[PDB]
């Protein structure tokens, strides 16, 4: 069961490090009154579906 | 022990030739009042972390 628990404490860590790298790469694009650079729309799932 | 000394006089030489090539490639960028061209920030570990 410890191996059944070392999965969930090692599959959340690799999911935590994508949400952080998703955040830090597009946080200035949400602060300005500007666009999203639609290449990064394709690669990163951005919250501006097209809005804000 | 001579082979134990011909390592350190052949692992410092290949480290000396990176510090020289790090120096000569970005020495004008430190003299001018200018930026660092952030591609070379990625490849070369530049002392302007972003400053000067």
């Amino acid at each position: 069961s410890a191996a059944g628990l070392a999965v969930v404490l090692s599959l959340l860590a690799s999911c935590y490090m994508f949400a952080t790298a998703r955040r830090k790469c597009l946080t200035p694009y949400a602060l300005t009154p500007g666009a999203v650079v639609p290449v990064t729309l394709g690669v990163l799932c951005c919250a501006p579906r097209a809005h804000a | 022990s001579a082979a134990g000394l011909a390592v350190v006089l052949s692992l410092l030489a290949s480290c000396y030739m990176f510090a020289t090539a790090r120096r000569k490639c970005l020495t004008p960028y430190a003299l001018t009042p200018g930026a660092v061209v952030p591609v070379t920030l990625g490849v070369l570990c530049c002392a302007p972390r972003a400053h000067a």
Partner: peptide, 29 residues
């Protein structure tokens, strides 16, 4: 067991391999 701990053992070092590269770029700019 090596197949289980080699998949998400190899997923995790790729998740660090992004975040080392992203903080190398968007600290610089």
């Amino acid at each position: 067991v090596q197949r289980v701990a080699g998949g998400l053992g190899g997923l995790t070092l790729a998740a660090v391999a992004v975040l080392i590269l992203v903080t190398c770029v968007t600290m610089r700019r």
